[PDB]
Amino acid sequence: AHFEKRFLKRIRDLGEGHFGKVELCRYGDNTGEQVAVKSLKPHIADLKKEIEILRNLYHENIVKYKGICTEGIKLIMEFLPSGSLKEYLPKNKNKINLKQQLKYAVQICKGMDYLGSRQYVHRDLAARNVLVESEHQVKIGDFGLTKAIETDKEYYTVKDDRDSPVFWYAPECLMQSKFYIASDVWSFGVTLHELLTYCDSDSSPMALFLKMIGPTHGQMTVTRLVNTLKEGKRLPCPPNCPDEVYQLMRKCWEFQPSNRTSFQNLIEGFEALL
Amino acid sequence: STHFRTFRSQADFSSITRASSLLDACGFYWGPLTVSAAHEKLKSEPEGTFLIRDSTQKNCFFAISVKTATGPTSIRINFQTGRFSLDGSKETFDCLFKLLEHYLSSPRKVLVTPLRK
Numbered sequence: 519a520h521f522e523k524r525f526l527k528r529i530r531d532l533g534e535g536h537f538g539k540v541e542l543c544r545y546g547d548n549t550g551e552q553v554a555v556k557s558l559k560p561h562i563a564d565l566k567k568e569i570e571i572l573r574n575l576y577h578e579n580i581v582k583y584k585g586i587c588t589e590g591i592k593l594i595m596e597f598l599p600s601g602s603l604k605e606y607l608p609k610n611k612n613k614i615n616l617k618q619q620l621k622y623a624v625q626i627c628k629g630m631d632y633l634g635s636r637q638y639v640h641r642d643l644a645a646r647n648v649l650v651e652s653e654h655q656v657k658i659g660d661f662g663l664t665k666a667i668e669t670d671k672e673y674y675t676v677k678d679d680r681d682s683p684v685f686w687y688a689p690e691c692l693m694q695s696k697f698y699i700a701s702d703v704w705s706f707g708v709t710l711h712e713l714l715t716y717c718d719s720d721s722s723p724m725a726l727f728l729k730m731i732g733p734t735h736g737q738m739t740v741t742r743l744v745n746t747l748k749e750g751k752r753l754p755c756p757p758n759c760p761d762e763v764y765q766l767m768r769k770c771w772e773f774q775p776s777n778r779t780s781f782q783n784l785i786e787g788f789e790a791l792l
Numbered sequence: 793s794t795h796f797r798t799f800r801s802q803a804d805f806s807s808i809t810r811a812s813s814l815l816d817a818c819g820f821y822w823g824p825l826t827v828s829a830a831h832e833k834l835k836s837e838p839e840g841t842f843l844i845r846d847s848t849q850k851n852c853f854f855a856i857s858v859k860t861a862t863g864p865t866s867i868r869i870n871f872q873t874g875r876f877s878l879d880g881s882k883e884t885f886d887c888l889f890k891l892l893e894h895y896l897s898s899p900r901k902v903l904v905t906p907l908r909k
């Protein structure tokens with residue numbers, strides 16, 4: 519489980535996140551398979567925590583852990599060629615129909631429900647972090663912000679002083695930094711909105727919420743986002759999205775965490791439509 | 793522009809909504825004014841005319857824009873655990889308007905008259 523830095527290929531780059539960079543490598547015979555290596559891209563203590571989380575997870579709809587490259591530390595994992603839904607959906611708009619989207623929504627819920635069974639809250643469930651293995655299979659990655667809820671507690675309060683994808687976050691996360699399992703359910707409804715809009719930039723969660731908010735900048739954007747959610751305003755029904763699917767999407771956006779649906783009820787909801 | 797910091801506590805969120813509520817009451821709060829837009833409104837005002845607006849930085853809430861001898865400038869309002877403080881000062885206040893009422897009596901005499909809408 520220990521890869522040597524002297525045999526890494528460093529082919530090209532795969533994708534850049536808000537916290538790190540991912541590159542494609544292989545490890546003169548070229549007998550090594552393709553692997554995705556995640557570097558720090560300036561911190562060092564957070565990447566070690568992310569590796570310990572990924573090595574603890576083992577699910578069909580979660581990116582498989584591979585190894586570690588010492589020096590600094592680099593994370594090695596399986597390489598999914600189709601990238602993320604943020605890149606796969608805009609390129610296959612006429613290929614992925616509604617039934618295939620609902621199939622993706624079921625796989626994401628089964629992966630998130632398993633993640634919740636291990637007291638883990640993802641805290642960054644978005645289409646850019648849902649990797650695509652094939653046309654019929656997707657996996658969940660990016661656990662840099664994942665936190666573990668204590669077995670006797672119902673949520674985990676964050677004192678990280680780090681940036682957060684606020685346009686995917688529930689009101690309790692924005693106002694108090696509290697993260698329930700229901701907080702990931704909120705993020706799923708936003709991610710489901712991305713999946714149905716094929717990750718269109720003009721219909722992104724940020725662009726639509728900024729339209730509802732109006733002129734804003736700075737950290738006061740968070741304040742105005744909370745006030746917009748307090749007014750009962752949510753992302754609209756995507757075009758060509760049936761009412762039965764949008765109702766399940768609205769169940770994820772209840773202001774109260776206790777009023778939101780669970781992942782197991784979402785699986786039963788989407789499976790009833792297939 | 794994608795990521796921000798969530799509020800660290802309900803008390804912190806109550807502090808900012810309390811300040812935003814008081815700022816909407818006064819006439820010299822302009823909300824989402826940029827640095828260039830605020831300085832254009834202040835360059836022709838008498839020296840010492842100040843203004844309250846939202847900061848443009850991700851990690852800051854409010855900022856003050858005043859006209860000094862060299863023209864319109866801007867100062868950050870640091871917020872930490874319900875306390876407000878200026879970027880170049882060590883005086884903390886539990887209220888934003890107590891911070892303003894203090895520097896209206898400061899020996900520096902930087903702020904004197906507010907620019908109303």
Ligand SMILES: Nc1ncnc2c1ncn2[C@@H]1O[C@H](COP(=O)(O)OP(=O)(O)O)[C@@H](O)[C@H]1O
Nearest residue numbers: 533534535536537538540554596597598602660
């Ligand atoms: N194993 C992988 N296979 C294919 N693409 C990947 C893989 N890992 C990461 N990526 C790409 O890298 C991008 C960002 O990776 P991620 O680790 O989520 O960033 P960060 O965690 O720094 O925010 C994603 O959009 C994804 O497309």
Ligand SMILES: [Mg+2]
Nearest residue numbers: 535646647660
């Ligand atoms: Mg990411």
Ligand SMILES: [Mg+2]
Nearest residue numbers: 535537660662
């Ligand atoms: Mg990340």
